Amino acid sequence: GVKLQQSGPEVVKPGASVKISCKASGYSFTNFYIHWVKQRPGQGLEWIGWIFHGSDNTEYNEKFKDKATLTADTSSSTAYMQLSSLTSEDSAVYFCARWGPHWYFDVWGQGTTVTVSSAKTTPPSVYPLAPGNSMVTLGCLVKGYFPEPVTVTWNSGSLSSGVHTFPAVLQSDLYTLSSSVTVPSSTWPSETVTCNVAHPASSTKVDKKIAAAG
Amino acid sequence: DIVLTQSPDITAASLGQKVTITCSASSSVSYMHWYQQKSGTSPKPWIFEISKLASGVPARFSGSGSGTSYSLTISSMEAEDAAIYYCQQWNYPFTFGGGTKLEIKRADAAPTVSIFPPSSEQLTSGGASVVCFLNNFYPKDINVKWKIDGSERQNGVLNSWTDQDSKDSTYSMSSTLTLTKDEYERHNSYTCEATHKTSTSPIVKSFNRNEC
Numbered sequence: 001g002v003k004l005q006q007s008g009p010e011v012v013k014p015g016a017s018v019k020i021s022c023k024a025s026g027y028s029f030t031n032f033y034i035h036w037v038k039q040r041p042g043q044g045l046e047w048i049g050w051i052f053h054g055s056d057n058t059e060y061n062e063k064f065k066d067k068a069t070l071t072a073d074t075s076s077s078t079a080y081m082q083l084s085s086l087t088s089e090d091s092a093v094y095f096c097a098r099w100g101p102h103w104y105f106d107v108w109g110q111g112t113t114v115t116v117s118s119a120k121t122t123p124p125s126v127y128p129l130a131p132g133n134s135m136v137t138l139g140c141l142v143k144g145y146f147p148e149p150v151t152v153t154w155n156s157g158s159l160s161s162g163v164h165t166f167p168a169v170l171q172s173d174l175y176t177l178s179s180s181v182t183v184p185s186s187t188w189p190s191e192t193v194t195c196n197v198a199h200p201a202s203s204t205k206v207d208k209k210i211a212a213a214g
Numbered sequence: 215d216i217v218l219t220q221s222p223d224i225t226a227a228s229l230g231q232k233v234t235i236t237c238s239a240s241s242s243v244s245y246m247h248w249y250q251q252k253s254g255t256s257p258k259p260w261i262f263e264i265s266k267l268a269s270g271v272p273a274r275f276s277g278s279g280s281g282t283s284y285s286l287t288i289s290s291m292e293a294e295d296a297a298i299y300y301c302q303q304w305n306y307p308f309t310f311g312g313g314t315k316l317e318i319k320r321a322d323a324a325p326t327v328s329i330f331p332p333s334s335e336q337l338t339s340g341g342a343s344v345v346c347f348l349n350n351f352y353p354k355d356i357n358v359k360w361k362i363d364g365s366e367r368q369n370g371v372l373n374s375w376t377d378q379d380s381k382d383s384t385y386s387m388s389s390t391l392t393l394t395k396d397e398y399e400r401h402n403s404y405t406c407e408a409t410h411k412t413s414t415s416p417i418v419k420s421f422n423r424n425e426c
Contacts, residue, residue, distance in 0.1 A: 045300055047308040061307050095256050104247045104262035111256050129330040129345055137328040166374040166388045178388045180347045214331040
C-alpha cells in the first residue's frame with residue numbers, strides 16, 4: 001500500500017550532523033507533501049516542517065529553522081532531513097508522514113531514532129538473577145551498554161509467556177535494563193533457563209544460564 | 215499562538231464503558247485531527263476534520279466539537295483502545311496537544327515481589343547490584359522502599375516500569391540498588407518493601423548477604 005520507508009537508527013556526537021531519509025513507494029510522491037515530526041524520549045509530538053517536491057518549497061516550525069533542512073529527490077521519491085550541530089535536546093525519534101488527499105497525516109514512516117551522545121559503543125555485562133519458591137521468578141541484569149537497544153530472549157524464545165523486559169535507564173551515560181521470567185517451580189531448577197542478550201551495535205550476543213545460589 | 219491542552223492527562227476505563235477525552239484550544243480553530251499512538255510505534259491517523267474517522271478506525275470511535283473545544287469518544291471501551299491520543303491543529307503550525315493516556319481498567323492486583331542478591335559472577339568482577347521486581351500489579355500507583363540493615367536508603371536506586379501487559383492488563387516495575395563490592399559487603403540484610411493499595415501492610419522481601 002502507500003508506504004514510507006525511513007532510514008535506520010543513528011548515534012551521533014554533539015556538534016555533528018546527520019541526514020535521515022524517508023522513501024515513498026506506492027504513489028506519485030510529488031503529488032503529496034511529506035511532513036516531519038519529532039518525539040523526544042517519553043514526551044509528545046512536535047511538527048518540524050513539510051516539503052512539497054521542490055528541494056525548497058518548504059515550510060518549517062520556526063523553532064526548527066536553523067536545525068533542520070528538508071530536501072527531496074524526485075528521481076528516487078525520497079525526502080531527507082538534515083539536522084545540524086546536534087545537542088542532547090535533539091535525541092528523539094523522527095517520523096515522516098504524508099499529507100494525504102483528505103488533508104491529514106494519512107501514512108506514517110516507522111520512525112528513526114537519533115541518539116546524540118559522546119558515549120562509546122559498549123557491550124553490556126550480563127548477570128543472572130536467582131530466587132526462591134512456587135511459580136518462580138528469575139532474572140537477567142543487562143548493565144552498562146551503549147547505545148540502545150538490546151534484545152532479550154529466554155531459552156531462545158521457548159519461554160515467552162511470563163516474560164517482562166523493563167525499559168532501560170541511563171546512568172553514567174550508559175544504559176542498564178533487566179528482564180524477568182516467571183515459571184512453574186516444577187520447571188526450574190529442574191530444567192535449564194537461560195537468558196540471551198543481543199546487542200547489535202557492538203555485534204555481541206551472550207547466553208547466561210540461571211544457576212541456583214544467590 | 216494557539217495552545218492545545220488535552221484533558222484528562224491519564225484516565226482508565228472498564229471494558230464496555232463509554233469514554234470521552236477533550237482538547238481545548240487557547241483560541242478558536244476551524245478543525246481538529248486526532249492520532250492514536252501505542253508504545254514503540256508511529257502515530258496512526260484516527261480522526262480528521264473533527265468528526266471523520268480515518269481508515270482502520272472502528273465505528274465505536276467518534277469526534278465532535280467546534281471553536282475552542284473538541285472531543286474524542288469511544289462508545290464502548292475495548293482493551294485494544296489503551297493508548298495515547300493526541301489532538302492536532304489542522305493548519306500551520308500543525309501543533310499537537312500534549313496527549314491523553316487511556317488505560318484499560320481491571321480488578322486490583324497486589325504485586326508479586328522478588329528480590330535478587332548480586333550474582334557471583336558480578337561479585338568476582340568486583341561489582342554488586344541488588345534487584346527487586348514488583349510484578350503484575352494493578353493501579354500503577356506503587357512505592358518501593360529499600361532497607362539495608364534496617365535503615366532506609368534513598369539513593370543509588372534506579373527504577374523502570376512497563377506499560378499494561380496486553381494479556382492481564384497489569385503493570386510491573388523493577389528497582390535496582392547499585393553498589394561496589396565493599397558497599398554491599400559491609401551490610402548484611404537487604405530488604406525490598408512495596409506499598410500498594412491492595413494492602414494496608416507493605417509487601418516485604420529480603421535476604422542476608424551471608425546466608426540467603
